[PDB]
Amino acid sequence: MKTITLYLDPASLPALNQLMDFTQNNEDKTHPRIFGLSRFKIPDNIITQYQNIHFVELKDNRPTEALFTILDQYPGNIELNIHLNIAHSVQLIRPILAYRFAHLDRVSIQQLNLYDDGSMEYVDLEKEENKDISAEIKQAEKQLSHYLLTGKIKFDNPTIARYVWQSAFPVKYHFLSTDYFEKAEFLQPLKEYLAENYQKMDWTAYQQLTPEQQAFYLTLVGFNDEVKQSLEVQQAKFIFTGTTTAEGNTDVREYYAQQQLNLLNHFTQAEGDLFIGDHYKIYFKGHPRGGEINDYILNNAKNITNIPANISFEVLMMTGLLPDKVGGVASSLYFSLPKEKISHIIFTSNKNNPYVKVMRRLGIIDASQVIFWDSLKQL
Ligand SMILES: Nc1ccn([C@@H]2O[C@H](COP(=O)(O)O)[C@@H](O)[C@H]2O)c(=O)n1
Structure with missing residues (x-):
């Protein structure tokens, strides 16, 4: 079938990381791509070099309905390669899941690549210090299941829910700080749960280009x-x-x-x-x-x-x-x-x-x- 890559971020850090991903895979000029980066405008001279390149606005941390018009242009079986802002992952993927519900036979989620919004995720995690992290994870997976099956959002712990995506899709987390997950002892259950699904943001990538x-x-x-x-x-x-x-x-x-x-x-x-x-x-x-x-x-x-x-x-x-x-x-x-x-x-x-x-x-x-x-x- 066909893979469609989506780059979504209303902030700065995830977008910066996603633009590197785009550069690394820039040879393929026909691979369908959908850019939803609020803080970045891809230069016209670059856009012209590519085909099947689309742009979508984000409103209230989620791509607008204009996304459905883009996707309707691919009638065949499509697998979505989604790049997201971790803090806003639940809302950013919302319209994608809604579309999937209406086209369950040809639309599937291939994988997720998530990147930290920045300090925000750590400040939020810091507030969960006195929680039973192991238990919070189980409850979040359960409520995530409810979101995937009903399309409705209700998380007792919005923060921890940002990290249970592996319970539903192949995922890769890119953290601004992998040390935080190792130094914050209360988060040990989360670090162990994430297993091999994360890595630190690679700042040496540019040098390898x-x-x-x-x-x-x-x-x-x-x-x-x-x-x-x-x-x-x-x-x-x-x-x-x-x-x-x-x-x-x-x-x-x-x-x-x-x-x-x-x-x-x-x-x-x-x-x-x-x-x-x-x-x-x-x-x-x-x-x-x-x-x-x-x-x-x-x-x-x-x-x-x-x-x-x-x-x-x-x-x-x-x-x-x-x-x-x-x-x-x-x-x-x-x-x-x-x-x-x-x-x-x-x-x-x-x-x-x-x-x-x-x-x-x-x-x-x-x-x-x-x-x-x-x-x-x-x-
Ligand atoms: N003065 C600043 C503040 C932030 N930033 C970029 O914006 C991101 C998020 O920054 P804040 O945590 O300050 O919001 C950073 O990872 C940095 O890329 C910048 O380039 N110059």
Whole structure:
């Protein structure tokens, strides 16, 4: 029959990983592909090279009904190769299962490849610390069965349910942190349950690509020559990393912008609590979804080189263009950054802190008192 590959992610990290998958399998120009990556626009010059390449919008963390129109274009027997965001897996696959129900004779799920949204999955797991994990797993598999058979969603534990897909399909999990699963003792039952169905995100994949594929990849993630050259300068560098929010909208978005600018000053100003030194060239790597928050930094800071917000930080690691130091608000990017390059990681207020616990458990931060940006004086 025929295999159809779907790349779905409303966030950044899973999409970054999925674009690598696309690059590795980019030779086949006719393999049907459906892209549902909210934060990525595949360049037109690349699209034209492929046939049976489709695009679908995501709304409320699930592909829209426009997905059914695409699938109807393949009348034969089709096996779905689905790539998903782990945190949002249940909703992202919802429309796919609904379609399958109506075309049970020709539509089947071939396999699932799941990738971490980022720190979110770990913060969520951290909250399950006092649960009987072994029992939570059994209940989740049961409720997953109910979802697969009735199409209805009802999970007593939405978090653990994200990890019981193997009970229904061939699966492969790609974790931002395999250490968390080994260091969090309360999760031992889960680690054992997952058996050989997981691996850590492979950040060395880019280096294994051919010279042609690496350029294909760089084009997909937006890493142009101008940015590359700005990072090839000879001088110690410091990249300030931004964050974003979705809380209280406007008011909170403006609070975030102001606290982030103040944070930057604490790193770059001689009188700052986190002053890095004067020999560093300053760069700003804003959050992909920072929006007005990123603009606030550029409009109110000086002598700072902007690295387009849409360019995922990990790309610098892949290209071997990491700076000497990195500092900013807690982010998923710090999970794969070499410890020697960490300046300071600051946490946001606006409510024990689950995120703090996760990074401490992984040794990303030490036992010392954590810095929340609401405790930094206005410079
Ligand atoms: N300042 C930032 C913040 C996040 N990011 C990318 O977005 C992802 C998720 O980041 P957050 O955990 O900060 O939301 C990361 O894995 C990183 O790829 C970035 O490239 N630059």
